[PDB]
């Protein structure tokens, strides 16, 4: 089925520009939307006119026109009709609810069979994070739960308040949320949006370049989310490619994809809940992959109550990329989320006991009570998810004792 | 093109350097149809319309009879 991309905020718009440039390069679509000389299926991400032009399905949302202007000028094939221009931002989103609801309904009507909503946004984006938090609520309300949502939220490197307020709605409404940290991205680079764009583009490779299996997003996601509570994913990318000293075999890709240094978020000891590895090359040797799967299963520490299966998808490289060597992406579901969530909660508590900057949000007695109850609910939800991820680790998870 | 199993075969795997009868014989942008082929083509085109799903003679009553009954209602 078709997918709709939502871009919110300055960071979201920049990441989306890199993402769409990568996708258009992979499908050979020119900057003006004209084709270049089919077995691939860009229709899932591009709308095809009866004049042979490809335009992205994405929707651009931002508080200021400079970022949107740069993005549109860089890629002229964006449709201008889809362009629209913390608590203050969220209340502003309430005012524009009708316009945005109709704007999204236009894209849904334009496609034939909708599958999922992609969202590119930054949790630490301030006002834009507020408008994206409202976007999740309105979409989930109007379209129910038949269509799932995927959020490629960028985590932060007064900010604690914003991170908690955005994470409350991220937990409530998102169906499968990727976690990216600028710290680990710049550590890997030792710009940064080119890693996120690459990971997001590769995550959907089996859909755009069909093969024997994994033809739908339901199959890709369902392998990684045993419970709707544990919805945060850790993504790992192998950087050593296109150099002379590349990984010599896909088997070494499978073994060295699990290194903790390549993960896109700060990690000690972790337990894996689910696994799925992407291998993308013109030709793939099966016996190497079998040996690598066996070693990966014998090496990785799974939680007791999970089936303990490692899945390797055999992605196909784009014809428009000339004979490049193998590359691969790893997406995992770990219990390492407790560390980052604990860090966020510690910062939030430290800055909530001290009334440092709450004057910018508490306007009156009723506003004080409103913000206090909202903050308490967000804190309780985050603690609930931490406790759930902690109870997953132990062996008595399925016991009623 | 009336694509068929005989048009599938690319005979140029044979050398076939020669062409006949001559370059003077036009290629005409339309399928070359025999006389019987033209008669059959127009007959099938008419038959498809007259014997459509709604216009066929097949409550043990045909669609045409019901339509005509409604038309009589409008006349009244």
């Amino acid at each position: 089925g078709e997918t709709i991309t939502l871009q919110v905020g300055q960071c979201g718009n920049q990441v989306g520009l890199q993402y769409w440039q990568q996708l258009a390069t992979e499908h050979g679509i020119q900057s003006d939307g004209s084709s270049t000389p089919r077995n691939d299926h860009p229709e899932l991400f591009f709308t095809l006119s009866d004049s042979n032009t490809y335009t992205p399905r994405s929707i651009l949302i931002d508080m200021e026109p400079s970022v949107i202007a740069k993005s549109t000028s860089a890629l002229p094939m964006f449709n201008p009709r889809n362009v629209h221009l913390w608590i203050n931002g969220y209340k502003y989103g309430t005012e524009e609810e009708e316009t945005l609801l109709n704007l999204i309904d236009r894209e849904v009507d334009k496609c034939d069979n909708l599958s999922n909503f992609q969202l590119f946004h930054s949790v630490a984006g301030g006002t834009g994070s507020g408008v994206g938090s409202k976007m999740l609520e309105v979409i989930s309300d109007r379209y129910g739960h038949k269509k799932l949502l995927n959020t490629f939220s960028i985590f932060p490197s007064v900010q604690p308040y914003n991170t908690i307020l955005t994470l409350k709605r991220l937990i409530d409404y998102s169906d499968a949320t990727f976690v990216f940290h600028n710290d680990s991205l710049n550590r890997i680079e030792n710009g940064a949006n080119k890693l996120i764009a690459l990971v997001s583009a590769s995550v959907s490779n089996p859909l755009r370049f069909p093969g024997y299996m994994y033809s739908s997003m339901e199959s890709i996601v369902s392998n990684l989310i045993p419970t709707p509570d544990l919805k945060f994913l850790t993504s790992s990318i192998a950087p050593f490619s296109t150099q002379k000293h590349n990984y010599l075999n896909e088997y070494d890709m499978l073994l060295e994809l699990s290194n903790d240094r390549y993960k896109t978020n700060r990690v000690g000891d972790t337990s894996y809940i689910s696994m799925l590895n992407y291998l993308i090359g013109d030709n793939l040797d099966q016996r190497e992959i079998r040996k690598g799967i066996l070693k990966s299963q014998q090496r990785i520490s799974f939680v007791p109550w999970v089936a303990r299966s490692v899945l390797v998808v055999h992605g196909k490289k784009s014809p428009y990329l000339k004979n490049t060597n193998l590359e691969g992406i790893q997406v995992t579901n770990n219990t390492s989320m407790i560390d980052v969530f604990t860090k966020i909660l510690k910062q939030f508590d430290l800055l909530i006991k001290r009334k440092a900057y709450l004057n910018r949000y508490y306007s009156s007695v009723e506003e004080e009570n409103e913000v206090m109850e909202m903050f308490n609910e967000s804190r309780e939800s985050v603690k609930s998810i931490i406790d759930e991820y902690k109870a997953c680790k132990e062996i008595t998870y399925l016991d009623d004792d | 093109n009336k694509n068929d199993q005989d048009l599938l075969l690319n005979k140029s795997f044979m050398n076939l350097s020669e062409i006949d009868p001559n370059n003077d014989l036009p290629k005409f942008n339309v399928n070359l149809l025999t006389i019987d082929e033209l008669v059959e083509l127009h007959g099938t085109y008419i038959d498809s319309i007259i014997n459509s799903s709604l216009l066929n003679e097949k409550t043990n009553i045909s669609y045409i009879d019901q339509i005509f009954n409604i038309l009589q209602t409008i006349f009244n």
Binding site: N113 | L8, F13
Partner: protein, 99 residues
């Protein structure tokens, strides 16, 4: 016996497929079996069988495009491209599961 039968059948298939009445257009030089008591009968049969295989092989591969027929069968039967069948199952999910 098998070589004789299959040589004749293969030439018959070629003639019936490409429409040739006889192999005059190829203008190839051929040697006929001079006698039943000749010593090279097996060699002549082998040569004729190889000629028939050469012609029928080139017909199938170059002319009838068999290599692409193999990929087409792979796709349609074994789902080497699973997008279309996935759409089919999605569209008729309620029907297929009924008795």
């Amino acid at each position: 016996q098998s070589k004789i039968l299959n040589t004749g059948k293969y030439l018959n298939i070629f003639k019936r497929c490409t429409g040739l009445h006889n192999f005059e257009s190829l203008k190839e030089k051929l040697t006929t079996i001079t006698s039943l008591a000749a010593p090279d009968l097996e060699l002549k049969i082998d040569e004729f069988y190889h000629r028939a295989n050469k012609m029928l092989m080139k017909l199938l591969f170059d002319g009838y495009n068999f290599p692409s027929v193999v990929n087409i069968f792979q796709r349609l039967f074994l789902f080497a491209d699973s997008f279309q069948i996935d759409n089919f199952i999605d569209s008729t999910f309620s029907e297929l599961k009924r008795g």
